[PDB]
Design a binder for this molecule. Structure first.
Ligand SMILES: Nc1ncnc2c1ncn2[C@@H]1O[C@H](COP(=O)(O)OP(=O)(O)OP(O)(O)=S)[C@@H](O)[C@H]1O
Ligand SMILES: Nc1ncnc2c1ncn2[C@@H]1O[C@H](COP(=O)(O)OP(=O)(O)OP(O)(O)=S)[C@@H](O)[C@H]1O
Ligand SMILES: Nc1ncnc2c1ncn2[C@@H]1O[C@H](COP(=O)(O)OP(=O)(O)OP(O)(O)=S)[C@@H](O)[C@H]1O
Ligand SMILES: Nc1ncnc2c1ncn2[C@@H]1O[C@H](COP(=O)(O)OP(=O)(O)O)[C@@H](O)[C@H]1O
Ligand SMILES: [Mg+2]
Ligand SMILES: [Mg+2]
Ligand SMILES: [Mg+2]
Lengths: 436, 277, 347, 319, 327
DNA sequence: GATACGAATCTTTTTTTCCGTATAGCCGTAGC
DNA sequence: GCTACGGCTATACGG
DNA sequence: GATTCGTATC
């Protein structure tokens, strides 16, 4: 009378569906942070849902905490409304009370259910408190493990001012660059469960439910079910749920599992090189648009197509095809973000790369668009030109426009100030650097 | 650059309360204030550079000690100080003298960013408690000092009105007149009027029109004069008039408004001018 | 100091380029009461701003060249707390709202609606304050729609003298309410005469006066560019213009020329990626994409190894992709499309 | 007036045996209702195929007389914020109502696709801690609008479009309980205009019997029109231009369909159009989008639609 | 005070018997009312077809003098967000009926302007309170409505008004205003109407204002064409004859003379010549394609401004270069 | 010993409504 | 018995 | 989805 993913949970560490290398790395990290003076203070675990990110920690605790504890885990509970406690200080109070968990009361603090990081005011408090923990002057602190599930936030708001947290729920949209790149933060990213451990740990459940599966004559079509489930999903919880829903059934209901969200580089590779399952490009494009519209209907995707279409043959394809790709991508930019623009700019590229698709082609490695660096260099140029205009109007009396600066006074004036002043405080080098 | 002054609130109540009148106004207007310590006179300035400007003149005889030397012209050094800290210190001294005391303020310029050593004493009841404070300030440059000048006001054939003193029979009536418009929450513009003597507070909007009037006697020492002003400036005018007996109101036709306040210390008279655009 | 801003004429009689444009500006300044709204259009570097300053000097007297700079704060709907510097002076005001960005509406609806409702009654002539809008062609078509009625209704107390080049992206209502003043660029003779004035004033020793002619033809009717070139050449040659003095050119011009040479020589996908890298490098320096496309086209049309068919294809693709960029958001797509089309047509 | 309910509400099934369609799913729901152990489920599909009346009937049968204090139905008309998830759902889960063995409390979160992200992330903990007493039944039209961690703990039940025989059976049941005169062609026309939507079949049948009484092809097609996607498909799959312009004008312009509606339906039809080369399909998408931009800018005229059809035929004949 | 109203609002049908054109919808909603069951209705059609009049007349017939307290009319002029959907519509549907013993009516006009968040929250409001409240949705663009809201409401299509209905309303307007309309002017009004009665009334009012004596003179075709500024049916064929039969020197002169005799606009001539050429028997299948794809581009360029003479010559060029295919 | 499999890498800064906090107004109670 | 002030609370604002 | 490196296993 219970769900099979709760009645067949691992009791030891050897029944956890995790890769051996991943388990070993997590073991080494966790054993490192339990030492008196640990280099790492917070262990961040990223990955998709059901990758045993919390099924390995809650069984490593039972073997590691009662080894360094002088004589389990302390999960943070978001739904705890204390009287006289505003809903932004709950995590602060939890951290303040969790810093006393040291020897003679040692416990590893696990943060799986993060605070309401979808609100702009408490996400900042979350980041600030984590930074305070990472920069804490306390010589002795308990180990901290944060498990963040990488899931795509569905489109619900109606605004083009959507931030990172309104597109993807990942460790980058919750933690700033300083926390992620902090020297005392070890990040062990996880991967979906492969088709081998999923095929073994489900046959375990089947041979435990031997009686029920034999009574309903569900023992000759067993492997055809475990193999299909493992080939469809990389989830340890949804696979067990589907197995229970199929074994408890008494008919021919077609089994189903949760759908996976195609990533950014995954979708770029699907558009450029094509999918290995469907040979019909129309069906693939329609399913990509109906399953990953939050990613296709953006600008970074159309920029990545332009930045990665040269990796089909490592640049060894006809220029007449490259022109047919870029002219369509440019015609799509004038459609003002209409839904008929992305569906054309993703179909023309796929058709172009399909018409030249032959075996023996050694493809290249895709990369993220470089427009984010161009914008930062542009902002640096803006600041330098503002400084040039400021110094040219208080040490002198002359008003000049920004366009004139970028065209003539961003190069000629640095040379003049290098010869008139330096040769025989100020600006002497080219604005925003040379043209290299 | 050596600056040192001594203030005694109990010794002289008028010049001291005008100092309270200047500090409260520069606190209510905006953060930070400009203090130019001329060798013969002080001037406390709050320049937002549409928003109004206050120019209060403080003489040198108000304080017991006014030793001021600097390398600039006429021993002028100009401070930029956060008004919250000095307002808190000043309120602390107000409570010090309210509990019963007669101690003086020793304010010294102790070190471009500097600070003022505002130290005083308090006695509870025959105990010695020393209150030491340090308000961080910045040194304004002489070139930066000359960029700040008092706004000019002319009346070729305009109209200044003598507001009745608040100590008289009509003073409370006129104070109620000025504060009547402040009761409404949804007011942002007031249209002052000048007839030669009646002045009216008119607030006309899309669907409602205030038209408050003063039927009491008025004086104009020795034509229409209307101006559109903000409500916050009217609140500042109310606060300035509440602490002044001699208040001078001059209205320009669609150019500006000036709230002139003066205290007759006679001796140089301390004056507060609120330029309003 | 910069020789551009040290020999700038400060009066209508000190402006020696076009005698016909000075005689028309003097006619405009004869009766300043009925001065209409003016739109000065012409090639860059002609001196339209200098002539506007001279007209303001002839109207309001001297004192229009003492500029005080104050920064005004504007708040959008999202409370972004935007910023804009407002160069001003007695009798006139100068604004380049296009710098604010796409929020230029929030400044032409505040500054141009607050100084047009002041009436400038000082102590009785109300007069008018002249507002110069630099780069009038960069407005986002919403700043102009909120400006047409603004300058039509309040024309009594304000006058607008907008300075722009290539007044195509200016809407028809704005051009209808504004008197259009064309400012032709000087010929090489006038530029050479001006450069002669500078060199005798600065006492630099030139030889073979033909050098000033060379600077005039290299500047392409740009007095600012010609003066900057002259100053750079004199400083690099130690105030001695030798007959073999190198005519220095902007670095981005040389890089665009190298890009054209790469396009002509190498026509492949990898060469296209290198061209994208060069284009991104140029874009990182706040160089407008329209100007980059124009320079690329007119440098590819100067190649002597290309026939008439290739040049016609290049100019057709240039027009098509320029129109595409004018109605687009990301210019890298259009620039890559133009380069790829040129590469495909050349081979 | 009268208290006579519309037949959509008058003939809403109150038992799981009256819900037609998806037999393999309804039978499993009945098996759950008899056994008792109800897993967390997400029921998704097209509108009007019986996703709400299935969950409600399952909860009713599973809880018996404890339905009033054993279910918590939270729809989009209620404030399904994070505070409600943290307080009301938490207190309903913490309730200790005693039930027959195998039975569980059911939280029917209908229209869960409109729920915010933080509410779903709190629901994660809500179903994690309190899973032995209460069960969550999400009902949506799109499964991807529920976050992946929430979909992991649930069992996905994908309802499909109803066929032409299940809808016919339910319509015959209604016509037998309402003494409605009918003809076979009229019922077939009702099925054709329903497009696998039982609600839009009941509504059309009620409108036809109210307006004319007898359910024939004429009385049906004179009150409810043929589906406009199937006319747009006929217009976009013609051979000549003079035969596509006729179907455009006389069947979409003089009938009252807006040009923007025609273009929006044309894009959807082109996306699902079969037996068409992919280059032709993408060119048709581009030409439809170019006309969509013009219509959105203001020029929503019949001449623009004619030009779009002409360009589609141009790309069809050679390009 | 009703005589100081515009003719569009002065002649608004107060009862269901004054709504012309739509017959299969009126004769269905009347049977719905008489039977006693009114389902959730959706009214769809072009502007000026009579949807907002039909629903108000229907509710007036249903409730009589209790229209004010039993009808919640919400339109695009109100902030019909999700908060309003949950805080006004929900408690209007939840509360019991006020003495009428029947159902309440919630009329959501211009529902295509409602957000998807406010439309996905009205679905269960409609479904739950069907017994004591009903919903009518009026829209002209059905692509902005969510599919579930489109499925919960019975759909009634308001066709463009036929010629007979427009002429019968024109007769009533002429009777009330004591006006006279020529037989050749009624056809012109119907043709320019494009199935809109608001255009009928707005043109007839200006025609009455144009007449010097509105009690003796008659509104001829000249009066209509001068008031609405449309080309005459002869000026639309003379220009086409010049373009398709004359040279490039006299066709331009004829076009510029037609556009200057009465100040006709280029777009009106384009849209008239398009209708004239649509009846042609062009036997190339490419002449029609070229004509459509070029005249649509000229029409799109006209809407954004530009040189008028250049576009006028472009029309002549596009019509001339296309028939070269046919020949 | 061949091969299937698996991990790592390929990355980033107009509008509407909602969730939590700031703040002024009003009422209850101590004390002068 | 009356008033000032602290605590509670409803409401507009901000990201 | 592509390449490259590294295992485990049959
Ligand atoms: N062999 C197994 N290995 C791992 N998990 C198992 C196994 N058998 C059952 N489970 C259950 O599967 C679930 C996996 O949960 P976890 O992956 O640890 O949590 P998670 O990674 O945070 O997933 P989310 O993001 O919270 S949905 C737990 O409820 C386990 O009890
Ligand atoms: N399979 C079915 N058997 C019988 N009636 C059905 C069936 N499907 C729908 N209906 C009718 O549809 C109406 C109820 O529709 P619902 O089941 O609430 O819709 P739904 O499928 O949940 O779609 P949404 O998500 O609410 S738009 C009643 O009139 C039912 O009789
Ligand atoms: N069938 C009709 N019979 C008589 N007058 C009509 C008819 N249809 C429209 N009208 C007139 O046109 C006016 C406007 O029509 P409405 O019904 O108010 O608006 P509408 O037809 O619903 O168009 P939209 O979609 O609201 S813009 C009415 O007030 C009538 O005067
Ligand atoms: N008549 C003239 N005589 C000398 N120099 C001139 C003259 N007209 C313009 N200039 C030069 O042009 C420069 C300014 O050009 P600018 O006003 O920026 O041109 P534009 O208005 O076309 O951008 C000045 O430095 C000035 O030296
Ligand atoms: Mg977990
Ligand atoms: Mg439902
Ligand atoms: Mg209407």
């Amino acid at each position: 009378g219970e769900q099979w993913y709760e009645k067949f949970k691992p009791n030891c560490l050897e029944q956890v569906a995790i890769h051996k290398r991943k388990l070993k790395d997590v073991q080494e990290a966790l054993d490192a942070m339990f030492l008196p003076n640990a280099k790492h203070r917070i262990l961040l675990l990223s990955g998709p849902s059901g990758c045993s990110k919390s099924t390995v920690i809650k069984e490593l605790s039972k073997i590691l905490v009662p080894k360094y504890r002088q004589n389990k885990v302390t999960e943070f509970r978001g739904d705890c409304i204390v009287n006289d406690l505003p809903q932004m200080e709950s995590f602060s109070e939890f951290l303040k009370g969790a810093r006393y968990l040291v020897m003679s009361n040692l416990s590893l603090i696990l943060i799986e259910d993060l605070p309401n990081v979808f609100h702009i005011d408490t996400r900042r408090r979350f980041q600030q408190l984590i930074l305070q923990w990472l920069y804490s002057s306390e010589p002795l602190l308990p180990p901290l493990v944060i498990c963040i599930t990488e899931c795509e936030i569905p489109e619900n708001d109606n605004n083009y001012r959507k931030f990172g947290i309104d597109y993807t729920f990942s460790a980058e949209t919750i933690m700033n660059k300083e926390i992620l790149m902090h020297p005392r933060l070890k990040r062990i990213k996880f991967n979906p469960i492969n088709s081998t451990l999923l095929k073994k740990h489900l046959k375990f459940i089947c041979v435990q439910n031997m009686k029920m599966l034999k009574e309903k004559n569900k023992w000759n079509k067993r492997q055809e079910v475990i193999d299909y489930i493992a080939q469809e999903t990389g989830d340890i919880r949804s696979a067990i749920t589907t197995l229970q829903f199929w074994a408890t059934s008494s008919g021919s209901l077609p089994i189903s599992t949760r759908e996976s969200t195609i990533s950014y580089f995954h979708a770029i590779g699907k558009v450029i090189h094509g999918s290995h399952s469907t040979n019909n490009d129309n069906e693939m494009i329609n399913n990509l648009f109906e399953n990953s519209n939050n990613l296709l209907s953006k600008e970074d995707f159309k920029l990545g197509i332009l930045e990665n279409y040269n990796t089909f043959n490592k640049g060894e394809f006809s220029i007449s095809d490259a022109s047919s790709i870029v002219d369509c991508l440019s015609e799509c930019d004038n459609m003002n973000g209409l839904p008929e623009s992305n569906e054309y700019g993703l179909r023309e590229v796929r058709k172009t790369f399909r018409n030249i698709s032959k075996q023996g082609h050694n493809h290249g490695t895709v990369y993220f668009p470089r427009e984010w660096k161009v914008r930062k260099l542009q902002n640096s140029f803006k600041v330098q030109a503002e400084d040039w205009l400021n110094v040219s109007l208080y040490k002198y009396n002359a008003v000049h426009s920004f366009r004139n600066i970028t065209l003539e006074f961003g190069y000629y004036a640095p040379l003049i100030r290098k010869c008139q002043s330096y040769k025989k405080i100020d600006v002497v080098d080219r604005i925003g650097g040379p043209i290299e | 650059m050596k600056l040192k002054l001594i203030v005694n609130g109990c010794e002289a109540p008028d010049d001291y309360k005008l100092l309270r009148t200047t500090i409260n106004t520069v606190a209510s207007l905006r953060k930070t204030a400009i203090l130019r310590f001329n060798s013969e006179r002080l001037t406390i300035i709050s320049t937002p550079k549409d928003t109004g400007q206050l120019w209060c003149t403080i003489p040198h005889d108000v304080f017991r000690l006014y030793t001021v030397i600097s390398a600039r012209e006429l021993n002028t050094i100009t401070m930029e100080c956060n008004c919250d800290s000095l307002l808190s210190v000043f309120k602390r001294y107000d409570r010090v003298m309210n509990q019963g005391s007669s101690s003086n303020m020793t304010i010294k310029l102790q070190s471009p960013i500097c600070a003022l050593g505002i130290t005083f004493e308090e006695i509870v009841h025959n105990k010695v408690i020393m209150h030491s404070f340090k308000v961080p300030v910045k040194l304004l440059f002489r070139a930066q000092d000359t960029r700040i000048q008092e706004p000019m006001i002319n009346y070729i054939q305009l109209m200044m009105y003598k507001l009745p003193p608040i100590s008289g029979e009509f003073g409370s009536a006129f104070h109620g007149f000025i504060r009547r418009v402040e009761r409404y929450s949804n007011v942002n513009h007031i249209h002052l009027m000048g007839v030669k003597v009646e002045l009216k507070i008119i607030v006309n909007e899309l669907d409602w029109h205030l038209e408050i009037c003063w039927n009491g006697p008025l004086d104009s020492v020795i034509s229409t004069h209307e101006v559109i002003i903000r409500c916050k400036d009217w609140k500042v005018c109310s606060k300035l008039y509440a602490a002044f007996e001699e208040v001078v109101l001059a209205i320009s036709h669609d150019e500006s408004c000036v709230f002139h306040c003066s205290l007759d210390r006679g001796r140089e008279r301390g004056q507060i001018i609120y330029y309003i655009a | 100091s910069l020789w551009v801003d040290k020999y700038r004429p400060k009066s209508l009689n000190a402006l020696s380029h076009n005698e016909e444009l000075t005689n028309f500006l003097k006619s405009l300044s004869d009766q300043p009461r009925d001065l209409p709204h003016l739109l000065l259009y012409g090639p860059n570097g002609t001196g339209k701003k200098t002539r506007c300053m001279a007209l303001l000097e002839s109207i309001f007297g001297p004192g229009v060249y003492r500029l005080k700079i104050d920064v005004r704060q504007f708040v959008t709907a999202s409370n972004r707390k935007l910023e804009l510097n407002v160069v001003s002076s007695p009798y006139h005001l100068e604004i380049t709202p296009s710098d604010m960005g796409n929020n230029d509406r929030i400044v032409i609806q505040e500054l141009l609606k607050e100084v047009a409702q002041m009436e400038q009654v000082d102590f009785l002539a109300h007069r008018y304050k002249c507002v110069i809008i630099n780069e009038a062609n960069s407005l986002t078509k919403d700043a102009q729609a909120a400006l047409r009625r603004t300058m039509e209704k309040y024309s009594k107390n304000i006058r607008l003298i907008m300075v722009c080049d290539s007044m195509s992206p200016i809407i028809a209502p704005i051009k209808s309410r504004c008197l259009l003043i064309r400012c032709p660029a000087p010929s090489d003779s006038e530029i050479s005469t001006i450069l002669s004035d500078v060199v005798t004033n600065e006492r630099i020793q030139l030889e073979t006066k033909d050098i000033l002619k060379r600077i005039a033809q290299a500047s392409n009717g740009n007095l600012r560019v010609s003066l900057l070139m002259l100053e750079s050449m004199a400083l690099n040659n130690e105030l001695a213009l030798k007959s073999s003095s190198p005519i220095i050119k902007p670095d981005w011009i040389i890089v665009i020329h190298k890009l054209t040479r790469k396009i002509v020589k190498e026509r492949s996908v990898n060469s296209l990626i290198e061209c994208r890298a060069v284009l991104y490098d140029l874009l990182a320096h706040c160089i407008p994409a329209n100007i980059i496309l124009k320079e690329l086209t007119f440098s590819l049309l100067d190649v002597e190894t290309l026939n008439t068919t290739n040049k016609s294809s290049i100019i057709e693709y240039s027009s098509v992709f320029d129109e595409r960029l004018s109605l687009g958001n990301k210019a890298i797509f259009h620039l890559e499309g133009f380069i790829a089309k040129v590469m495909c047509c050349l081979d | 007036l009268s208290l006579q309910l519309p037949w959509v509400e008058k003939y809403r099934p109150q038992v799981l045996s009256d819900i037609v369609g998806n037999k393999e799913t309804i039978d499993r729901l009945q098996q759950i209702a008899k056994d008792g152990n109800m897993p967390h489920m997400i029921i998704s599909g097209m509108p009007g195929i019986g996703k709400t009346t299935s969950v409600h009937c399952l909860a009713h049968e599973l809880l018996g007389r404890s339905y009033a204090d054993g279910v918590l139905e939270l729809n989009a008309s209620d404030d399904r914020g994070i505070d409600v998830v943290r307080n009301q759902i938490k207190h309903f889960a913490q309730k200790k109502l005693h039930l027959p063995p195998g039975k569980h409390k059911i939280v029917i979160l209908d229209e869960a696709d409109s729920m915010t992200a933080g509410a779903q992330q709190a629901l994660r903990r809500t179903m994690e801690l309190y899973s032995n007493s209460t069960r969550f039944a999400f009902a949506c039209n799109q499964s991807n609008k529920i976050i992946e961690p929430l979909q992991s703990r649930c069992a996905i039940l994908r309802y499909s479009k109803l066929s032409d025989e299940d809808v016919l059976k339910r319509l015959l049941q209604i016509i037998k309980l309402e003494d409605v005169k009918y003809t076979n062609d009229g019922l077939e026309a009702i099925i054709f205009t329903a497009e696998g939507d039982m609600r839009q079949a009941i509504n059309n049948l009620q409108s036809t019997v109210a307006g004319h009484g007898l359910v024939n092809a004429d009385n049906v097609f004179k009150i409810v029109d043929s589906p406009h996607p199937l006319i747009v498909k006929k217009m976009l799959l013609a051979s000549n231009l003079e035969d596509s312009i006729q179907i455009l004008r006389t069947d979409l312009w003089k009938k009252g369909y807006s040009s923007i509606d025609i273009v929006t339906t044309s894009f959807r039809v082109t996306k699902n159009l079969a037996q068409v080369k992919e280059s032709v399909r993408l060119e048709m998408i581009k030409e439809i989008g170019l006309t969509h931009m013009r219509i959105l800018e203001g020029v929503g005229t019949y001449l623009q639609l004619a030009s779009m059809l002409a360009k589609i035929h141009k790309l069809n004949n050679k390009a | 005070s009703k005589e100081n109203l515009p003719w569009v609002e002065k002649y608004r049908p107060e009862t269901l018997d004054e709504v012309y054109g739509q017959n299969e919808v009126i004769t269905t909603v009347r049977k719905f009312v008489d039977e006693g069951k009114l389902p959730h209705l959706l009214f769809y059609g072009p502007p000026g077809t009579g949807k907002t009049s039909t629903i108000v007349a229907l509710a007036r017939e249903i409730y009589g003098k209790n229209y004010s307290n039993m009808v919640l009319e919400l339109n695009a002029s109100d902030d019909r967000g999700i908060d309003v959907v949950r805080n006004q519509i929900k408690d209007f549907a939840s509360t019991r009926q006020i003495f009428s013993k029947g159902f309440k009516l919630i009329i959501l006009d211009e529902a295509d302007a409602m957000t998807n968040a406010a439309q996905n929250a009205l679905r269960r409001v409609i479904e739950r309170y069907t017994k004591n409240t009903r919903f009518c949705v009026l829209a002209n663009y059905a692509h902005k409505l969510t599919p579930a809201l489109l499925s919960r409401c019975t759909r009634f299509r308001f066709q463009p008004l036929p010629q007979e209905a427009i002429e019968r309303r024109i007769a009533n307007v002429l009777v009330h205003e004591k006006l006279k309309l020529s037989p050749n002017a009624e056809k012109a009004l119907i043709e320019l109407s494009n199935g809109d009665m608001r255009r009928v009334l707005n043109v007839l009012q200006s025609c009455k204002a144009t007449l010097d004596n509105p009690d003796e003179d008659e509104i001829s075709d000249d009066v209509i064409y001068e008031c609405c500024g449309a080309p005459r049916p002869s000026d639309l064929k003379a220009v086409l004859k010049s373009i398709l039969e004359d040279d490039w020197g006299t066709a331009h002169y004829t076009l510029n003379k037609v556009r200057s005799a009465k100040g006709l606009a280029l777009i009106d001539l384009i849209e008239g010549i398009v209708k004239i050429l649509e009846d042609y028997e062009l036997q190339n299948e490419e002449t029609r394609v070229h004509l459509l794809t070029k005249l649509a581009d000229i029409e799109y360029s006209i809407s954004k401004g530009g040189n008028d003479q250049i576009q006028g010559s472009a029309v002549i060029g596009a019509i001339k270069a296309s028939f070269e295919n046919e020949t």
